[PDB]
Swiss-Prot record, chain D:
GO terms for molecular function: metallopeptidase activity. The lineage of its organism: Eukaryota, Fungi, Dikarya, Ascomycota, Saccharomycotina. The keyword Nucleotidyltransferase does not apply. The gene is RPN8. Present with 19800 molecules/cell in log phase SD medium. Keywords: Acetylation, Phosphoprotein, Proteasome. One of its GO terms (cellular component) is proteasome complex. InterPro entries: EIF3F/CSN6-like_C, JAMM/MPN+_dom, MPN, MPN_RPN7_8. Signal peptide: none annotated. N-acetylated by NAT1. Residues 4-138 form the MPN domain. Pfam families: JAB (PF01398), MitMem_reg (PF13012). This is 26S proteasome regulatory subunit RPN8. The keyword Acetylation applies. It comes from Saccharomyces cerevisiae (strain ATCC 204508 / S288c). Acts as a regulatory subunit of the 26S proteasome which is involved in the ATP-dependent degradation of ubiquitinated proteins.
Swiss-Prot record, chain F:
Belongs to the proteasome subunit S9 family. Component of the lid subcomplex of the 26S proteasome, a multiprotein complex involved in the ATP-dependent degradation of ubiquitinated proteins. In the complex, RPN6 is required for proteasome assembly. Present with 16800 molecules/cell in log phase SD medium. The gene is RPN6. It comes from the Eukaryota. This is 26S proteasome regulatory subunit RPN6. It comes from Saccharomyces cerevisiae (strain ATCC 204508 / S288c). N-acetylated by NAT1. Component of the lid subcomplex of the 19S proteasome regulatory particle complex (also named PA700 complex). The 26S proteasome consists of a 20S proteasome core and two 19S regulatory subunits.
From Swiss-Prot, chain H:
Acts as a regulatory subunit of the 26S proteasome which is involved in the ATP-dependent degradation of ubiquitinated proteins. This is 26S proteasome regulatory subunit RPN9. Present with 12400 molecules/cell in log phase SD medium. Belongs to the proteasome subunit S11 family. The chain holds residues 198 to 387 of 393 of the full protein. It comes from the Eukaryota. Residues 1-158 form the PCI domain.
Curated annotation (Swiss-Prot), chain I:
The JAMM motif is required for the deubiquitination and degradation of ubiquitinated substrates. Component of the lid subcomplex of the 26S proteasome, a multiprotein complex involved in the ATP-dependent degradation of ubiquitinated proteins. RPN11 is the only catalytically active member of the lid and serves as the essential deubiquitinase of the proteasome. Belongs to the peptidase M67A family. This is Ubiquitin carboxyl-terminal hydrolase RPN11. One of its GO terms (cellular component) is cytosol. Residues 5-140 form the MPN domain. The gene is RPN11. The keyword Zinc applies.
Length: 34, 189, 257, 255, 58, 51, 262, 190, 284, 62
């Protein structure tokens, strides 16, 4: 029963992370670069 | 929108994927601002017909409207070595660039050079220079007067003659050029 | 699947150009531009190596090992000898000298790093073969779990000039990639013999076989990727420079009493 | 027993014979196959058709011409010499007097046992529209043989151009358990013993399972070792974008 | 997309330029074959080819 | 038995004996050795690219 | 009917032939085509990995480049340059008078060929080389075919005059192919003739103006004293005198028998 | 079972069943006396003149009285103990057929020593020795529990019998179909 | 104008199988179908033909064996009018047929719409199924019916067209190869049940039930050792480069064992569900 | 092996093919004319003796 909770604990770090990559990145494509 | 999206993905037919992305532009005629953002996402794929359909579908709503940035979306589609992708791009450029000269859009200088550049060049595609000559006459159609107006304030509703003439354009080299039906969408200003 | 599948051919890599692009040389002699594997980039990709290619599509397949087995300059190699170690008495003097010169440099050589010296690259043997030489050395390779390769003085003997030393170049080149390898030399006096006369035709090869043997030993620095055991049968005035503790360490003479 | 390997070209062309002529339920087409019947694995490299006429209202009425086979075999001799007649196929699930008698006519030109194939023209249910059966006597008894689909290298590649996990098996497993319940009920009405005696022995394969529960969780615990790997994979998923996320702040200074 | 382009390439060898021709051809020596006149590519200058110049031929 | 020669345990009170199998476990926690070495290095290098 | 069978036989398609140069893996073998350059082929069916290994003649495919049939190892004309005959020819009546010597030779030769388990229970090994020397043409031909007749093993005649020549690595491939033929067929015995030309110790036992002598001296030593010897095949040599040979080959472990032919 | 072959008169059917009557006495193989009941053999003969040996031992398995069959036979076949040894197997074999689906619908295979002791007319101490002789002669395969006094068998030869047998076997398939509406509907939606 | 040939999925596979065996060996076959000039083109049934001593030629067609097949193919609807012939040849840079050159002119006298199809790859097919046909031109291509109005014309761009040795001229006077394939409702469902990726069919409920459960002896047997294999793959990568740079020459090392061990955990989770899916009928 | 023949043409190409009933084991011999294919190099049928490579500059006097 406790073993199944550790699977969700590692999966809980996904939606708060993979989504946070492009989050700041919208300023790179909009702003002009050298 | 959700129906036409799954047709161009699950189905492996390139002609159907091309017809599905062109059909999306007729639903988006009301909002021309989000059209370049939708066709640019579909402009990246492994199929040429997908890029060919999104090219002409972009110029349908963006012809008589503003938002000059739709030309930059059609810029990488011209460099495509595929023949029918370049032709649909040239026709799409001629629709949006109407009356865009004289310090309005910077891309009016590059399109005017491509008139005689693609035809005389042997490196380009056969069908690429055939549409470049047609695109040269669209901007100057009616003595640089008539333009393509679809879903505007003058008509007040969806133009029946203009929407059918654009559907017939989707079939060009498959049977015999149908471009004669496009004359219904040209009205003078 | 289309890169390899069933059809495969042989080719020699030369120089790359771009990622997944390279120029090679096939067996027929005509060069072709193949598609370099995505795994091979710079360090993993060998500058010059014999590799595998595709028949028609001509794509890179795999890096083939530099096999030294052919119809010319044949050098025998033993696989898993059946001789039991320490099967002959009276070897207690050598049994202490064998482990330090064989088992230690191929296994415990890290102890030499604590001392600050490079591991011995071989050992010299004296006396006629058959006594603590043939059966004894072949039984030591089973204890060290190393590849036992037979390169003798009367081997790689053929009338084509230059392949004798060329085959020597290919054996020690492969021995540098595989650490557990042992190359035994029986009757080195055949190699240690020099030219006392001009032979014109017939045998000119007396002095060529020492070029690549010393290049892989006296030419490079001191490192042991392989065990080179030189057994001297009968030699008096021959000084090839194989003697002295330049590379090989111990000089073992079979007791006559 | 033996084995039957049928190329996908034979099963694809056999179904086409039904649609072209719009054959009704009163007529059933019959055809022949080629291959090598000498080995234990029957391989079908070719198939043909025959002008077979049959009456539905009378099972004693059938017409089969063997002269058309003779002229056809002479044409194959100039094409492929390794192709011999290994049997024949017919259309429709029903086995009547006309279908069982004509099997002996093909035994004259076939040295081994002619392969029996029942072609389903309506392709209704499960897979394998054409089942491979063998004729053997103890009354002719038709036994089912393992059906495998294997073709040559060039044939398998050409099919991919024409068409160019856990839930999938469960969808077909639910309909299979329900179909087995109807086979017992339908067989009961036919009697009012042979199949029921075999099914009772197959079904024979918690008194001894009181201590057998531990080994179930032991296998599940070993599966959890892979779940710990999944956690490590999830830990590695957390390392991936941090390489990119730290490069985001590096571009803020450059831009 | 790069798979179909690279895997279908028949291969190309290396050769040395001998002399240039005003007809838009060039003579390139081939090691397994010999001196053979080929056609200059559209993206390659015929005048930039010098003696013993390393070039790639299909 | 104290030297791990014979595998078994006795009973001093009742004079009995019990069965002791040689393996007491398998390889599980060994995977944490590669896990602890990665999070003590890779994680530290991520702070370097941030500053 | 036989005419039609010949018509059907002409439609058949043959295959190529080659030998494995290198073993890459179990399912992949690096080969060399006799009709073309070097290729690397696969396996098809009925491939026995015990009888097929590195250096074995295979059947190459002209199209898909696969191995279909397994062929025995042959390079030189082993049925022409080497004489192979079933059992023996000369009987015992011609070798008569040597019975005292032959009785001792058959015990160390005929026995390990028939029942190899005789010496296994004792813990010893049977001898390999047996030297039969005497006047030319007297006792060399008789004792050669008489031993193979009583034992039942095939008669292999491979004279030493087919070894030393002007070629690149001739003596290297003669012994290997001779060892490969005796490996395929166990009941065989190899015989030689005029071995005095391929021998000699020179001085330091190297090569001076003789290219093919030293390669023969070492290879014959590495076959018997190596990891794989011939237990079902005995090596026989013939010369005028044993003192004209190389003492390196006369040491124990290879040649255990010196028999004079009077 | 063959209708078209073996065409004989009515008088020869009784003599054919006479050999079938003495064949099932000293051995249990190939089902039991109940197998010839379905085939047109027992119903085609007469119940007297010592032709009832197939009928007598058929119902004698549940009754368990040897004296009923002993009075209808002679001294020749009654002096061999093998007749009484193999007859007790078919008394247990009927109980052995109950180990698949009969009473328990939970698919629990359990057979105790008390149910086979009264049915086979054998004491409790000979129950252990009876199982050893059955496996040794190749009659049945399996193992028995000597602690809790239980029997769990292995593959056997179930008869062609029907009714209550097929009624319990079709109810198990309903449980397979009921799980389609339980476990199947949950996996299909997910 | 030029015809557009639509070949059914059944006829396309037969022509590839008949001309399959051998590079040098040439064969011949006949094509059937019913279509009208300009559009409506189709190919119904195809079958091999007997070969004479000249190989591919006009005299190699035997009307005796052909007339007997007409009554045989009429029952199932396979009987049609001859639309041409297909052949197999080793192939060259130009004129793939070393025998047939002008024999096509004799084919045009019998049928004007008849063509000769030659298989270029000869077991070299990469999956695109590229075949070559031929049509007689002779005097034409000047002020006549306009062929290149249909599909994919103006071939010969750069040096690569089809075989790439033909470029513009192709075989004879730019025959303008046009080939298309189509499938029906029965052909769509049959191919998916036979060859798509790998054929597991013939038992639908026993596909993952037999392979993931009863096959554990040949697959997952000694699963405790199988879990050690997942560690050796991670130890081969994670132990090398922990610095997220170039030292031991690795980049995607954390993602190399990530996707490989993801299916191992997935397969272990699938069999875990199928473990309870055996339905032992326990309950109480 | 036993039922297959090994033929070597003048092209330096050895082809391994099974024997056909049209040819006989006594008719296939070295230094003989055996008609084969130019492309596939497959044995078809033996030819009568015409050009035997007579090795000219050889004195023949009856």
């Amino acid at each position: 029963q406790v073993f199944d909770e550790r699977i969700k604990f590692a999966n809980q770090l996904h939606d708060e992370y993979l989504v946070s990559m492009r989050y700041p990145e919208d300023k790179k494509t909009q702003q002009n670069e050298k | 929108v959700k129906r036409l999206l799954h047709v161009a993905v699950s189905d492996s037919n390139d002609d159907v994927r091309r017809a599905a992305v062109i059909a999306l532009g007729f639903v988006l005629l009301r909002d021309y601002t989000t059209v370049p953002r939708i066709v640019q996402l579909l402009s990246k794929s492994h199929n040429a017909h997908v890029r060919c359909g999104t090219a002409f579908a972009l110029g349908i709503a963006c012809a008589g409207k503003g938002l000059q940035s739709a030309i930059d979306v059609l810029d990488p589609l011209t460099k495509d070595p595929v023949d029918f992708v370049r032709q649909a791009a040239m026709i799409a450029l001629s629709m949006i660039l109407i009356q865009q000269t004289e310090k309005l859009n910077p891309q009016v200088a590059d399109i005017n050079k491509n008139f005689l550049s693609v035809i005389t060049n042997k490196h380009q595609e056969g069908l690429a220079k055939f549409g470049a000559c047609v695109a040269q006459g669209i901007m100057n159609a009616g003595g640089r007067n008539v333009t393509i107006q679809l879903e505007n304030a003058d008509t007040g509703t969806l133009d029946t003659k203009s929407v059918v003439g654009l559907v017939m354009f989707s079939q060009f080299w498959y049977w015999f050029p149908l471009a004669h039906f496009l004359s219904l969408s040209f009205t003078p200003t | 699947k289309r890169i390899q599948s069933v059809p495969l051919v042989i080719g020699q890599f030369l120089e790359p150009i771009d990622q997944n692009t390279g120029i090679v040389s096939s067996t027929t002699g005509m060069s072709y531009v193949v598609r370099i594997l995505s795994t091979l980039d710079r360090e993993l990709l060998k500058p010059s190596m014999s590799v595998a290619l595709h028949r028609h599509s001509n794509a890179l397949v795999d890096i083939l090992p530099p096999d030294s087995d052919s119809s010319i300059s044949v050098m025998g190699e033993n696989e898993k000898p059946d001789v039991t170690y320490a099967d002959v008495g009276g070897l207690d003097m050598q049994k202490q000298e064998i482990r330090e010169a064989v088992e230690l440099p191929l296994v415990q050589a890290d102890l030499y790093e604590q001392i600050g010296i490079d591991p011995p690259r071989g050992v010299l043997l004296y006396g006629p073969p058959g006594t603590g030489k043939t059966m004894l050395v072949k039984a030591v390779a089973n204890s060290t779990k190393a590849a036992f390769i037979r390169v003798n003085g009367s081997e790689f003997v053929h009338k084509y000039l230059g392949e004798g030393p060329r085959m020597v170049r290919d054996v020690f080149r492969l021995a540098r990639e595989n650490a557990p390898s042992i190359i035994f030399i029986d009757e080195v006096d055949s190699i240690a013999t020099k030219r006392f006369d001009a032979q014109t035709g017939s045998d000119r090869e007396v002095q060529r076989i020492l070029i690549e043997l010393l290049t892989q030993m006296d030419g490079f620095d001191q490192s042991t990727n392989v065990k080179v055991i030189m057994a001297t049968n009968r030699a008096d005035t021959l000084d090839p420079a194989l003697l002295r503790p330049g590379r090989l360490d111990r000089k073992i003479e079979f007791p006559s009493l | 027993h033996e084995k039957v390997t049928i190329a996908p070209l034979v099963l694809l062309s056999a179904l086409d014979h039904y649609e072209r002529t719009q054959t009704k339920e009163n007529k059933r087409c019959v055809g022949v196959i080629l291959g090598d019947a000498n080995s234990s694995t029957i391989r079908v490299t070719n198939s043909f058709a025959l002008p077979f006429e049959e009456d539905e209202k009378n099972s004693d009425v059938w017409f089969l011409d063997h002269n058309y086979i003779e002229n056809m075999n002479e044409m194959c001799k100039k094409i492929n010499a390794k192709e011999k007649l290994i049997g024949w196929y017919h259309s429709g699930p029903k086995l009547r007097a006309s279908d069982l008698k004509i099997n002996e006519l093909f035994k004259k030109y076939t040295q081994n046992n002619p392969l029996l194939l029942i072609v389903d023209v309506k392709q209704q249910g499960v897979g394998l529209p054409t089942d491979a059966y063998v004729a053997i006597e103890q009354e002719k008894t038709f036994l089912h043989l393992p059906c495998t689909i294997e073709a040559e290298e060039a044939e398998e590649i050409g099919v991919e151009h024409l068409l160019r996990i856990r839930l999938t098996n469960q969808l077909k497993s639910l309909k299979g358990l329900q179909s087995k319940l109807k086979d017992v009920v339908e067989y009961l009405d036919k009697v009012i013993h042979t199949i029921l005696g075999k099914l009772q022995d197959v079904f024979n394969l918690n008194n001894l399972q009181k201590a057998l529960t531990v080994k179930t969780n032991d296998e599940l615990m070993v599966i959890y070792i892979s779940n710990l790997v999944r956690s490590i994979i999830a830990f590695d998923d957390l390392i991936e974008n941090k390489i990119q996320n730290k490069k985001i702040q590096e571009q803020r200074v450059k831009d | 997309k790069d798979e179909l382009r690279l895997l279908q390439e028949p291969g190309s060898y290396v050769g040395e330029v001998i002399k240039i021709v005003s007809d838009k051809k060039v003579l390139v020596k081939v090691q397994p074959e010999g001196k053979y006149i080929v056609d200059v590519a559209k993206d390659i200058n015929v005048k930039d080819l010098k003696a013993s110049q390393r070039v790639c031929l299909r | 038995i104290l030297d791990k020669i014979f595998y078994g345990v006795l009973d001093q009170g009742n004079g009995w004996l019990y069965v002791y199998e040689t393996p007491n476990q398998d390889a599980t926690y060994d995977s944490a050795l590669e896990l602890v070495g990665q999070l003590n290095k890779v994680v530290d290098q991520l702070f370097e690219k941030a500053s | 009917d036989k005419t039609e069978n010949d018509i059907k036989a002409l439609q058949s398609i043959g295959q190529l032939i080659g030998e494995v140069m290198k073993e890459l893996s179990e399912e992949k073998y690096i080969v060399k085509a006799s009709s073309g350059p070097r290729y690397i082929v696969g396996v098809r069916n009925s491939v026995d990995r015990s009888k097929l290994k590195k250096g074995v003649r295979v059947t190459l495919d002209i199209t898909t480049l696969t191995i279909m049939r397994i062929l025995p190892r042959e390079t030189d004309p082993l049925v022409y340059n080497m004489t192979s005959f079933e059992q023996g020819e000369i009987t015992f009546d011609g070798i008569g008078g040597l019975t005292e010597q032959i009785r001792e030779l058959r015990e160390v030769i005929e026995l390990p060929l028939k029942n190899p388990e005789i010496f296994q229970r004792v813990g010893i090994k049977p001898p390999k080389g047996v030297l039969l020397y005497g006047p030319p043409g007297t006792g060399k031909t008789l004792l050669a075919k008489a031993v193979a007749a009583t034992i039942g093993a095939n008669f292999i005649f491979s004279p030493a005059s087919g070894i030393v020549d002007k070629y690149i690595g001739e003596s290297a491939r003669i012994i290997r192919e001779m060892f490969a033929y005796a490996k395929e067929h166990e009941p065989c015995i190899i015989f030689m003739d005029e071995v005095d030309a391929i021998g000699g110790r020179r001085f330091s036992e190297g090569t001076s103006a003789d290219r093919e002598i030293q390669r023969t001296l070492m290879e014959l030593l590495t076959q018997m004293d190596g990891f794989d010897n011939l237990g079902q095949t005995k090596i026989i040599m013939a010369t005028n005198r044993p003192d004209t040979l190389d003492p390196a080959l006369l040491r124990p472990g290879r040649l255990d028998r010196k028999v004079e032919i009077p | 079972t063959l209708e078209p072959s073996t065409s004989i008169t009515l008088a020869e059917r009784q003599q054919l069943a006479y050999d079938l009557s003495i064949s099932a006495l000293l051995g249990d193989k190939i089902y039991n006396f109940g197998e010839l009941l379905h085939h047109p053999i027992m119903e085609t003969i007469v119940n007297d003149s010592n032709y009832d040996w197939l009928f007598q031992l058929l119902n004698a398995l549940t009754v368990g009285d040897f004296d009923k069959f002993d009075s209808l036979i002679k001294v020749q076949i009654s002096k061999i103990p093998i007749l009484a040894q193999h007859e007790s197997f078919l008394r247990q074999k009927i109980c052995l057929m109950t180990l698949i689906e009969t009473v328990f619908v939970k698919n629990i295979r359990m057979l105790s020593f008390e149910d086979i002791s009264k049915a086979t007319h054998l004491p409790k101490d000979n129950v252990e020795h009876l199982v050893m002789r059955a496996i040794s002669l190749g009659l049945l395969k399996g193992s028995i529990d000597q602690v809790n006094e239980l029997v769990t068998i292995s593959w056997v030869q179930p008869r062609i019998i029907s009714g209550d047998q097929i009624t319990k076997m079709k109810d198990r398939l309903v449980e397979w179909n009921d799980q389609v509406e339980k476990l199947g509907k949950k996996m299909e939606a997910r | 104008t030029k015809e557009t040939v639509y070949i059914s999925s059944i006829a396309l596979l037969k022509m590839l199988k008949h001309g399959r065996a051998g590079v040098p060996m040439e064969v011949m076959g006949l094509m059937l179908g019913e279509f009208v000039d300009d559009y409506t083109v189709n190919v119904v049934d195809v079958f091999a033909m007997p070969q004479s001593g000249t190989g591919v030629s006009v005299e190699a067609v035997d009307d005796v064996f052909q007339a007997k097949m007409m009554d045989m193919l009429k029952q199932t609807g396979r009987d049609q009018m001859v639309v041409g012939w297909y052949h197999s040849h080793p192939g060259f840079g130009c004129w793939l047929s070393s025998v047939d050159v002008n024999t096509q002119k004799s084919f045009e006298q019998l049928n004007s719409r008849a063509v000769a199809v030659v298989v270029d790859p000869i077991q070299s097919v990469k999956g695109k199924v590229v075949i070559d046909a031929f049509r007689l031109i002779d005097t034409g291509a000047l002020i006549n019916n306009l062929e290149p109005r249909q599909t994919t014309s103006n071939t010969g761009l750069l040096n690569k067209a089809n075989i790439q040795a033909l470029i513009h001229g192709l075989n004879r006077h730019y025959y303008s190869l046009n080939i298309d394939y189509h499938k029906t409702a029965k052909e769509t469902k049959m191919l998916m049940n036979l060859h798509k990726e790998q054929w597991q069919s013939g038992l639908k409920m026993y596909d993952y039930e037999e392979k993931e459960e009863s096959n554990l002896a040949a697959t997952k047997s000694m699963v405790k050792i199988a879990e050690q294999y997942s560690k050796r793959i991670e130890e081969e990568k994670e132990l090398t480069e922990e610095e997220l740079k170039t030292r031991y020459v690795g980049r995607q090392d954390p993602k190399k064992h990530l996707s490989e061990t993801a299916d191992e955990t997935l397969e272990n989770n699938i069999v875990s569900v199928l473990t309870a899916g055996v339905n032992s009928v326990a309950i109480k | 092996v036993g039922k297959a023949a090994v033929v070597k043409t003048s092209s330096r190409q050895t082809v391994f093919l099974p024997m056909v009933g049209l040819v006989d084991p006594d008719k296939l011999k070295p230094n003989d004319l055996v008609g084969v294919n130019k492309d596939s190099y497959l044995i078809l049928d033996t030819l009568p003796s015409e050009f035997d490579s007579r090795v000219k500059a050889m004195e023949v006097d009856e």
